Amino acid sequence: GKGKPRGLNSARKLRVHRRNNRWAENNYKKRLLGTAFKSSPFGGSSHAKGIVLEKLGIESKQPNSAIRKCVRVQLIKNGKKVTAFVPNDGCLNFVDENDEVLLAGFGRKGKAKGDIPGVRFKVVKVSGVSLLALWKEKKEKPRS
């Protein structure tokens, strides 16, 4: 035969065998262990607010050459320290330290994007306004 039981009364083995083999899948294992909640900075939420601690100039990976502009953030919910990218041209100017940022994912299910080492997040808003809006120059960065 094909190395799996074919018998009419073989449903138990088939069901149990398949359960055991589903642990080899990536998404299944993460979903059942509860990795998103247990580890994972955001705790299985699409976004998270945090407080900017620092400004980091992260040297890009090879063969590109650049200093990608990033912020070390401490999230309000957990206290988990995290690095986030600050996208678009000269947007690090808007952030400043001790400014409340909303972070999002980068697009790759918790993998680092592009050539930026060790950065899995991005800034979306600073002090309750959009980085898009500040850089298109629609809204004004508040006093605090």
Partner RNA sequence: GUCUUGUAAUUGGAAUGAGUACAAUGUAAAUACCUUAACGAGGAACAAUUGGAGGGCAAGUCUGGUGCCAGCAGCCGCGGUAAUUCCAGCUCCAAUAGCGUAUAUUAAAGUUGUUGCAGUUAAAAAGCUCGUAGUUGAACUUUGGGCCCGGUUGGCCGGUCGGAUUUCCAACGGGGCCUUUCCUUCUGGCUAACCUUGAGUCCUUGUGGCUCUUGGCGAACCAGGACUUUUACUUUGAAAAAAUUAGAGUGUUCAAAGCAGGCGUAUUGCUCGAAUAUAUUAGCAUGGAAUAAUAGAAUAGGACGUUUGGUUCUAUUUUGUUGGUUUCUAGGACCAUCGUAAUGAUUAAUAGGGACGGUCGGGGGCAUCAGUAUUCAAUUGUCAGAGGUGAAAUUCUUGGAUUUAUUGAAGACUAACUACUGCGAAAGCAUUUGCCAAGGACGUUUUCAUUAAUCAAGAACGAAAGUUAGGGGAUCGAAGAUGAUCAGAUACCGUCGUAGUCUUAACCAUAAACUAUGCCGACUAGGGAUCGGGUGCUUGCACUCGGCACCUUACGAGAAAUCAAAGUCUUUGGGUUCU
The contact set with other proteins (CB under 8 A) reads 6-8
Q: Which of 5/107 has CB closer to other proteins? A: 5
**Residue count at the site for RNA (CB under 7 A)?**
54
Site for RNA (CB under 7 A): which residue of 49, 78, 100, 115? 115
- Shortest separation between residue 143's beta carbon and RNA, angstroms: 23
Residue 108 binding target from other proteins, RNA, none, CB below 5 to 8 Å by type: RNA
- Shortest separation between residue 142's beta carbon and RNA, angstroms: 20
Residue 29 binding target from RNA, other proteins, none, CB below 5 to 8 Å by type: none
Number of Cβ within a 10 Å radius of residue 41: 19
CA-CA distance, 127 to 47, in Å (whole number)? Answer: 15
Q: Using the rule CB under 7 A, is 8 a contact of RNA?
A: yes
Tokens of 27: 């998404």
* Single-letter amino acid, residue 138: K
Number of Cβ within a 10 Å radius of residue 6: 8
Task: Build a one-symbol-per-residue string for 35-64: x at contacts with RNA by CB under 7 A, - elsewhere.
Answer: -x-------xxxx------------x--xx
- Shortest separation between residue 139's beta carbon and RNA, angstroms: 12
Phi, psi of 52, deg, nearest 5: -65, 125
- Shortest separation between residue 125's beta carbon and RNA, angstroms: 10
Phi, psi of 93, deg, nearest 5: -60, -35
Q: How far is CA 32 from CA 23, 36, 109, 136, in A?
A: 9, 10, 17, 43
